[PDB]
């Protein structure tokens, strides 16, 4: 019997009664997993509509994915507990701590808010734990799949009630270096770990994340013993195993925005694509393109920055959008009017179409847990587009050889790579794109779900 | 042993001498070089460093191949000042500031918005190379007539020097000492490809690489392993095997120089009269964190019992204008004003001159000492202050200071980013009775006292030897 819980569900209630999940983001991923495994899933009720929906149906709400039909069991939290955790989680706290948003010299500075969110997080965690254990209460052997960085607190709680059941905690974001983790206040930095370690298996998308996690546990829990070879953690009589389970794309979930086809006609098209989130790094990308375009030969080339609006209420995300806009404008002032454009909407089909039309794809994240875009876009591109991929994406551990692996902070290197990519002829690119697509293709959602099960199974058996 | 010490500068002084109208050049004591002269196994010592005044430049021109300084104990040292191309020197200085290098090793970048490397990094890198060579050339050239020369290389700016020595002295013992932190592997990677590997290339050829703290060595090992797929690291032995050369990393903590150990700045005595004094002292550099300290102070005083309590921010100024420094000062002064405007007038004060006496007077007067650096290679103030404090002052110490690995058990140990913890620490420290404080201050001094400058020098000599022996 398999029980899967995910923090986040972006459902929309329109009329064809009609409830559906938004594509992209982790939510769709975990929902797809429920479809593969044929289960219910557990997630939180965000909006009032979600709260209303769960009240009417306690047994489960039914929604259609971007593909399939899944059955969610939403949780109604406290509307002040939950609203506050959805600040803690955000870059203000949790997001900034795992995706490297702090400079230390001037940010962060923790106060009373941190103790309060940390408490609310405890309530939010129990909310989830109680709800897993309940809907799994009539199960002789249950198997727990806990998905993500919000549900970090969860395994410790489950292990109390089900101390012999297999638990996988899977984190979809990076884990930072020990030194950076310590920035977090003491109760949080150890408390988070106290809740993760009781899991049978902790998984990430990349080795670097697993290594950083171990170094953290060794830096903060003295009565702990780690094995960098075995990727293991023994602590208070828990044996925890760390695993890399890379993920690429969903085969199933696979035309152009207004005026784009026209603007790009007879032009080489550079495409940056990513969420309105500072880590996607489109400011630096636009900057690096200007750098390439003074270095000439880039004529007849145009850049398109695809953004997907997301959490624009967090100052950072909206500042990122502003930084990017300013750069685009400055680029157009220097290189000539309409050289670069932004397209900032939420249509996932518009994005895939841009993946298709691209001559050069840039995925230069400052950091990224994986980046599924960098798998999808080659697998759909019809132009044999080159791919500039940052060394700091989890994906680079799988496709870095097959791509122009760049340092996301170096503009000169990013520009030179853009120049190189665009100077390559059709036959050179066709060749490269061919291999890229071969390196990408086998990393399917189905195959990742399998990797979770096979991993958990073997690790549970090695107790 | 024949010893060749290299560092950024050599502490020298000059007068006009009476009865000849002739310049006189001394060599103010307590220099790292003077201490090495005084050791056991060494026959003679030659010091190489950058010229940096019309005195330095003119002396170098007078004796281009070095001159022998006269020490106490009848010892002499050879001091060779390098006259670099000024433009090279200027750009290398800038390259070492928070504009680029300082932020790489002292954790100043948020990744999301800074940094963004341009052509400047490449220009700077090249000057760093030209400067590195200038040094390497000078070292070798004055160790030309030496059979088994021992090379001591100090300071971050001389990092590239070991590779350039081995090239010509493949069997010589070479110690490189780094006085600043070594950042995490993921953070080191932020640097542009040429620089991040470049630096490591120039370092590893040393026999021993030393830092002030374990965390630094570990972070360096993790960098190496992440960046040189050829290299091979051993955490247990703290040794690196790369291209047939085996490097050993040694943690050699330094606390203070006894030779360096006044009177309070104008108006400080009277302003602080019959008041408990909180002291924060550090250079005007972002990492010293003064302002998180002022904010933690407010947080503590708000909860009361900070009655009759006051706070002085000691700051040492910087000769150049570096933006990150200027912004830190703004941030501080804003925090100081918001504190005074809440706790009443003249509750907190900044004092901002360059005078090592005034600093010590402040150390002597302190009722509570704060050293909450965001990061710090060691922080030598946290040893000096307890050893000169006349009032059994407690110490709040960042867990991110190198010094914490030696003094953290003898101080109140803080996460320098957590304001609440810092405030609670301040409150506790100030609630203690004088006897409690006396005891904890005896222990604190007794743990600081051994870590002398001489003990540190010996640790290098001894460790380089042991490591050159395998
Ligand atoms: N709803 C929506 N989804 C998108 C859009 N563009 C891309 N996506 C999807 O969102 C995913 C992006 O994930 P990734 O690039 O790994 O970074 P993430 O944002 O952290 O998931 C991709 O798999 C796309 O299929 C868009 O404009 N709207
Ligand atoms: N030149 C100078 N030295 C100072 C001043 N204030 C303190 N110091 C000394 O500088 C040392 C502090 O160094 P530390 O905080 O470890 O970092 P550093 O600033 O890089 O040396 C202490 O031992 C003080 O004796 C000042 O205003 N000017
Ligand atoms: O601006 C550079 C600074 O370098 C030194 O500071 C380092 O060296 C100290 C000991 O020599 C350490 O205690 C300290 O942790 C390091 O930051 C120098 O002492 C400073 O004065 C310079 O400003």
Numbering used by the authors:
A (entry chain B): 5 to 20, 26 to 76, 78 to 264, 270 to 478
B (entry chain A): 4 to 264, 269 to 477
Authors' account:
Our comparative bioinformatics studies suggest that among those reported as glycosyltransferases are also pseudo-glycosyltransferases (such as VldE, EC 2.x.x.x), which do not recognize sugars as substrates but rather catalyze the formation of non-glycosidic C-N bonds in the biosynthesis of C7N-aminocyclitol-containing natural products such as acarbose and validamycin A. Validoxylamine A is generated through the dephosphorylation of validoxylamine A 7′-phosphate by VldH while validoxylamine A 7′-phosphate (VDO) results from a condensation of GDP-valienol and validamine 7-phosphate (both are pseudo-sugars) by the pseudo-glycosyltransferase, VldE. Similar to OtsA, VldE is comprised of two Rossman β/α/β domains which are oriented in a GT-B configuration. As was described in a recent crystallographic study of ValL, a VldE homolog from S. hygroscopicus subsp. jinganggensis, VldE is a homodimer.
Within the VldE•GDP•TRE structure, six monomers were modeled within the asymmetric unit (ASU). Represented within the six monomers were three differing conformations of the N-terminal Rossman-like domain (two monomers per conformation). The monomers of the first conformation contained both GDP and trehalose, and this first conformer was found to also have an “open” catalytic site with similar global conformation to the VldE•GDP•VDO complex (RMSD Cα = 0.705 Å). The sugar moiety of trehalose within donor cyclitol binding site makes interactions with the backbone amides of residues Gly384, Gln385, Asn386, and Leu387 as well with the side-chains of Asp383 and His182. However, the sugar moiety of trehalose occupying the acceptor cyclitol binding site makes only a single hydrogen bond with Arg290 in our study. A superimposition of trehalose and VDO within the VldE catalytic site shows that trehalose does not assume a binding pose comparable to VDO. Indicatively, Arg326 and Asn325 swing out of the catalytic site within our trehalose bound structure. The second and third conformers have only GDP within the catalytic site and both of these conformers share a dramatic shift in residues 11–50 which result in the “closing” of the catalytic site. Resultantly, Gly33, Gly34, and Thr35 move 10.9 Å towards the catalytic center, and within 4 Å of the ligand atoms. Therefore, the closing of the VldE catalytic site is more likely to work at least partially through a more dynamic, equilibrium based mechanism.
